[PDB]
Design a protein around this ligand. Structure first.
Ligand SMILES: Cc1c(C(=O)O)n2c3ccc(Cl)c(c13)-c1c(nn(C)c1C)CSCc1cc(n(C)n1)CCc1cc(c3ccc(F)cc3c1)OCCC2
Ligand SMILES: OC[C@H]1O[C@H](O[C@H]2[C@H](O)[C@@H](O)[C@@H](O)O[C@@H]2CO)[C@H](O)[C@@H](O)[C@@H]1O
Length: 515
C-alpha cells in the first residue's frame, strides 16, 4: 500500500541495461548509504498505473515517453523541476518529449528508433525496398536460410511499414479526432506484411526472443530492432550492419521514435533521493556509460556523452531512421492506440480477421475515447444550459450527431422515469465542487463494472451524469461539468472497451435504439 521511505525502488524494461543501472545504484549507495533496488517486471508499463493509483509501486519508472502523459493525467507522476544548469546539459527536443500540460513529467535519457540490422556474411548489401524481400528470401531459402525475422507480437515493430504509404496515429498541433489507422496507406502496409506471412517468408508466431535467437545464430539475414539489441549481437560474433529501413512504395519506413525517460512516482516519499540519483548519478557521462555498456541506449540526451558516441555508424543509422520517422505523442490516448493496433496486427497476421476488418476495429478502438467524450460532454452541457453546442462535430461527425440525437431521446426518458432514484442518489452524494466530482470515479467504476453489459446501462450512466450536470449549473458550478464528462467517459471506455468495439462503437448504439 505505501512506498518505503529511505530506499529507492526502480522499474525498467527487461530489454534495457538493468545491470548497468544497478551499478549506478551501487555508486549511489556508496555515497549515501541508501540501497537502490532495480527490478524489471513483465508488463511494467501496464502494472505501473495499477499499483501507482493505490499509492504503491516503484519510486522511479523507466519507459519510452509515450506512456507518461497518461500517467501524468492520472496524477501518478511528480513534477520534475531541474535547474537551468541541469536542463542545458540535455537536448531541448528531449525535454519536449517529457513535457505534458506545460510541466516536465520525467527526465529524458536517450533517443530510440528501430533500424534494419543485417548479416553481412549472408546479404553483403541490405535491400533498399520491402518489395525485393520475397525474392531475397527465395534465394536464401535455397541456402537453408531466410531473409527476415522480427517481432510480430508488438506493433512498434510493424508500425514503420504501416506508416510508410500513409498510415498515421494522430494527425499532426495534433488533431486527436483525426486517426489514420484504417486508410489506404495503412491497409497497403499491413497487406504487404500479411502477404509475407501467406507466402511463407515470415511466421505470424515470431516474437522478440525467436527473432533475436534466429538472427544471433546466423539463421536469418535480417532483423528489425533497436540499440538495446546490439550487445547480444556483439556477443554472438555475427558480422552485422545497422542501416536505413527499407522503403515501401518508394517511401521511407517511418519508425515511431521513443525517448527513454525516467519518471518519479507521485506517491514516493523519496522524491529528493530520486532527483539526486537521476541528475547526479545517472545523467552523467559515467552513469550513462555504465548503462550503455550493458545494453546500448541509442542517442543519449546528454550533450557531452552523445558527442562521444555520435561517430558510431550504428548510431548514425539510428538517427537517420529517427529523422524519417516521427516522435511519439505522449497523449493519454496512446495506450488505447497501441492496444487497438497490437490486436489488429496479430489478428491480420493469424488470419483471425482480414486486413480491412482488423484495421476497421483498430480505427474504432483508437477513436473511442474522443468520440465518446464528444457525445457525453455535449449531452451534459446542453442538458445543463438548455442550449446545444453549435460547433461542428468533426471527424466521424454523422455518428456523433446521430448518437447525440439518440441519447436525447433515450436519456431524457431515463431521467424522467428514474427521477425518484436520481434525485435520491444526487442528495446522498452531496456533490458540491470539483473535488467531489473527482471522487466519483472509484464508486462509478465499482457500480458500472458489476453485472451485465448493455446499452441501457450505458444510457443510465450518462443520463445520471446529465442529471448531475443540471444540478452543478444551478449551484454556479458549471466549471465542473467538463471534468464530470471526462470522468464518465474514462469509466465507460476503460470498463467496456472490447464490448464497445464489438458493437461498432457508437454506430451500434444508434442502430440498437433506431425507431
Ligand atoms: C442502477 C444504476 C446504474 C446502473 O445500471 O449501472 N447506474 C446508475 C446511476 C445512478 C443511479 Cl441513481 C442508479 C444507477 C440507480 C439506483 N437505483 N436506481 C433505480 C437507479 C436507476 C441507485 S443503485 C446504483 C448506484 C449509483 C450510485 N451508487 C453508489 N449505486 C452512485 C455512484 C454513481 C454511479 C454512477 C454515476 C454516473 C454518473 C455520475 F455523474 C455520477 C455517478 C455516481 O453510475 C453508475 C452506473 C449507472
Ligand atoms: O508495441 C507497442 C509499444 O511500443 C513501444 O514500446 C517499445 C519501447 O519504446 C522500446 O524501448 C522497446 O522496449 O520495445 C517496445 C516494444 O516492445 C511504446 O513505448 C509502448 O508504449 C507500446 O506499447
Amino acid at each position: 500500500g505505501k512506498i518505503e521511505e529511505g530506499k529507492l525502488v526502480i522499474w525498467i524494461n527487461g530489454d534495457k541495461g538493468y545491470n548497468g543501472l544497478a551499478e549506478v545504484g551501487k555508486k549511489f549507495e556508496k555515497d549515501t548509504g541508501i540501497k537502490v533496488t532495480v527490478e524489471h517486471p513483465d508488463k511494467l508499463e501496464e502494472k505501473f498505473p495499477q499499483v501507482a493509483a493505490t499509492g504503491d509501486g516503484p519510486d522511479i519508472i523507466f519507459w519510452a515517453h509515450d506512456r507518461f502523459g497518461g500517467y501524468a493525467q492520472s496524477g501518478l507522476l511528480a513534477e520534475i523541476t531541474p535547474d537551468k544548469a541541469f536542463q542545458d546539459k540535455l537536448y531541448p527536443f528531449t525535454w519536449d518529449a517529457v513535457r505534458y500540460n506545460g510541466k516536465l513529467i520525467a527526465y529524458p535519457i536517450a533517443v530510440e528508433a528501430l533500424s534494419l540490422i543485417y548479416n553481412k556474411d549472408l546479404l553483403p548489401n541490405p535491400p533498399k525496398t520491402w518489395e525485393e524481400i520475397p525474392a531475397l528470401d527465395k534465394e536464401l531459402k535455397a541456402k537453408g536460410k531466410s531473409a527476415l525475422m522480427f517481432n510480430l507480437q508488438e506493433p512498434y515493430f510493424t508500425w514503420p511499414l504501416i506508416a510508410a504509404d500513409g498510415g498515421y496515429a494522430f494527425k499532426y498541433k495534433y488533431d486527436i479526432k483525426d486517426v489514420g489507422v484504417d486508410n489506404a496507406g495503412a491497409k497497403a502496409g499491413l497487406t504487404f506484411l500479411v502477404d509475407l506471412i501467406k507466402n511463407k517468408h515470415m511466421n505470424a508466431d515470431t516474437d522478440y526472443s525467436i527473432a533475436e535467437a534466429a538472427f544471433n545464430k546466423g539463421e536469418t539475414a535480417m532483423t528489425i530492432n533497436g540499440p538495446w539489441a546490439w550487445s547480444n549481437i556483439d556477443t554472438s560474433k555475427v558480422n552485422y550492419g545497422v542501416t536505413v529501413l527499407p522503403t515501401f512504395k518508394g517511401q521511407p519506413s517511418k519508425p515511431f521514435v521513443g525517448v527513454l525517460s525516467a519518471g518519479i512516482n507521485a506517491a514516493s516519499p523519496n522524491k529528493e533521493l530520486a532527483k539526486e540519483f537521476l541528475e547526479n548519478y545517472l545523467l552523467t557521462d559515467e552513469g550513462l556509460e555504465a548503462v550503455n555498456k550493458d545494453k546500448p541506449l541509442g542517442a543519449v540526451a546528454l550533450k557531452s556523452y552523445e558527442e562521444e558516441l555520435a561517430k558510431d555508424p550504428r548510431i548514425a543509422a539510428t538517427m537517420e531512421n529517427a529523422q524519417k520517422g516521427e516522435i511519439m505523442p505522449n497523449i493519454p490516448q496512446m495506450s488505447a492506440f497501441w492496444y487497438a493496433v497490437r490486436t489488429a496486427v496479430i489478428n491480420a497476421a493469424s488470419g483471425r480477421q482480414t486486413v480491412d476488418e482488423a484495421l476497421k476495429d483498430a480505427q474504432t478502438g483508437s477513436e473511442l475515447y474522443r468520440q465518446s467524450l464528444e457525445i457525453i460532454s455535449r449531452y451534459l452541457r446542453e442538458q445543463a444550459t438548455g442550449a446545444a453546442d453549435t460547433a461542428p462535430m468533426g471527424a466521424s461527425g454523422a455518428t456523433s450527431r446521430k448518437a447525440l440525437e439518440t441519447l436525447r431521446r433515450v436519456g431524457d426518458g431515463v431521467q424522467r422515469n428514474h427521477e425518484t432514484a436520481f434525485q435520491g442518489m444526487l442528495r446522498k452524494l452531496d456533490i458540491k465542487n470539483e473535488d467531489d466530482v473527482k471522487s466519483l470515479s472509484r464508486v462509478m467504476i465499482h457500480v458500472f463494472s458489476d453485472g451485465v453489459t448493455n446499452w441501457g446501462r450505458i444510457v443510465t450512466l450518462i443520463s445520471f451524469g446529465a442529471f448531475v450536470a443540471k444540478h452543478l449549473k444551478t449551484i454556479n458550478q458549471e466549471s465542473c461539468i467538463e471534468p464530470l464528462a471526462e470522468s464518465i467517459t474514462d469509466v465507460l471506455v476503460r470498463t467496456k472497451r472490447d464490448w464497445l468495439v464489438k458493437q461498432r462503437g457508437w454506430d451500434g448504439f444508434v442502430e440498437f435504439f433506431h425507431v
